Amino acid sequence: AQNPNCNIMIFHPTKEEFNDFDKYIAYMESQGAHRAGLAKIIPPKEWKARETYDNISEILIATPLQQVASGRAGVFTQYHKKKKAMTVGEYRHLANSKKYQTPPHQNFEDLERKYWKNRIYNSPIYGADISGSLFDENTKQWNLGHLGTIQDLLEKECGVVIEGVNTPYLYFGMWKTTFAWHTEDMDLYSINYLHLGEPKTWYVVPPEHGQRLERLARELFPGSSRGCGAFLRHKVALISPTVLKENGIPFNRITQEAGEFMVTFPYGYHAGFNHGFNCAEAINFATPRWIDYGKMASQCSCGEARVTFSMDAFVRILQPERYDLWKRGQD
């Protein structure tokens, strides 16, 4: 079995290997990359996402989210307070202000220490989940607005034609902005490209050990667990690496820098934080190997998780027994 310790793997495809996205994903899995839950892909040196980022400041963040924490430094939840709209230029200036800017630090490890020590005492503002793309239309390789759609993959594998669309989302981050522990909707893959700015640190639990994380989370967040049998779908809980180590949960960590792709694999729980002002683009995708994960994915039916239009069909076709209860949650 390849990669039996579930280490995060890093790949350096040549320009030739970068042509066929599906083929490269299947290659990475042949080497065991999925066992980690997360992989890094460094694009060939000849590739570029677009020519420059000099003209992005007029993009609108219609609903910036202030991420307010509650709990203790290593075990906390966050709620998202909606703020007034602002442009990317306005947000960048805010991220760079004294109140929100990255502190002086020695290296990524010192910054990681400071994040876990001090995150809860601040409420950074995240421009998340903004439909759109920063890939040039002429970029033909690994262009996250030109991937094959998940609806087309389900149709190719299973023969059933379904409604829905699959588009990318932009993320504008600042120091301490945080992504809570989660897997993707319907335990899909995700791909994330860091277009510009400061790094993003990731934590990940191997898919084969995801239930260990869930059992810890039920212990650490006991009221939330009673409220919903899939409350990590709410995407609000954080647990530090120190706490994960104390409780014997297998995980790995890696820092993504500008110009790099990360892939998350089906049922790979992940969480992380931004080092400073940055912009990422991400989208969900599927392969044949996902189908079985989609059929088994947990679901939130309490009403909190509220998701896209396109998840309806996935539930309806892959999880018909759960469909009625899940749909009630959506309405």
Ligand X SMILES: O=C(O)CNC(=O)C(=O)O
- Residue 221 CB, nearest approach to Zn ion (Å): 12
* Alpha carbon distances (Å) from 148 to 36, 118, 154, 330: 24, 41, 11, 27
* Residue 328: partners with Cβ closer than 8 Å, 6 or more residues away: 301
| Window 175 to 194, contacts with Ni ion (CB under 5 A) | 190
CB 182 within 8 A of CB 245: no
To ligand X, the closest distance from the beta carbon of 201 in angstroms equals: 11
Least separation, in Å, of the C-beta of 62 and Mg ion? Answer: 14
Site string for ligand X, 233-262 (x = CB under 6 A): ------------------------------
Rule CB under 6 A: is residue 192 a binding residue for ligand X? yes
Choice from 67, 143, 264, 301 touching ligand X (CB under 6 A) = 264
Question: Of the ranges 39-47, 246-254, 295-303, 316-324, which one interacts with Zn ion (CB under 5 A)?
Answer: 295-303
In the chain, the amino acid numbered 151 is Q
Size of the site for Mg ion (CB under 5 A): 3
Closer to Zn ion by Cβ: residue 39 or 237: 237
Instruction: List the end-to-end C-alpha distance of the chain, in Å, as a whole number.
Output: 44
In the complex, the smallest distance separating the C-beta of residue 267 from ligand X, rounded to whole angstroms, is 13
Q: Which two tokens stand for residue 47?
A: 């590739």
- State the burial class of residue 150 (Cβ atoms within 10 Å of its Cβ: 0-12, 13-18, 19+): buried
How far is the C-alpha of 238 from the C-alpha of 76, rounded, in Å?
A: 5
If the CB atoms of residues 54 and 331 are measured against Mg ion, the closer one turns out to be: 54
From residue 216 to residue 235, the character string flagging contacts with Zn ion as x (rule: CB under 5 A) and all else as - is ------------x-------
Sequence-distant (6+) residues with CB within 8 A of 52 are: none
Residue from 280, 286, 305, 315 touching ligand X (CB under 6 A): that is: 280
DSSP 13-48: --TTTTS-HHHHHHHHHHTTGGGGSEEEEPPPTT--
At closest approach, how far in Å is the CB of 82 from ligand X? 17
The DSSP letter of residue 7 is P
Burial string for 274-306 (b: 16+ CB within 10 Å, else e) reads bbbbbbbbbbbbbbeebeebbeebbbbbbebbe
Q: Which of residues 164-183 bind ligand X (CB under 6 A)?
A: 171, 179
Site residues for Zn ion per CB under 5 A: 228, 300, 302, 304
Site residues for ligand X per CB under 6 A: 171, 179, 190, 192, 264, 270, 280, 282
Site residues for Mg ion per CB under 5 A: 56, 58-59
Give binding residues for Fe cation as ranges: 182, 184, 270
Site residues for Ni ion per CB under 5 A: 190
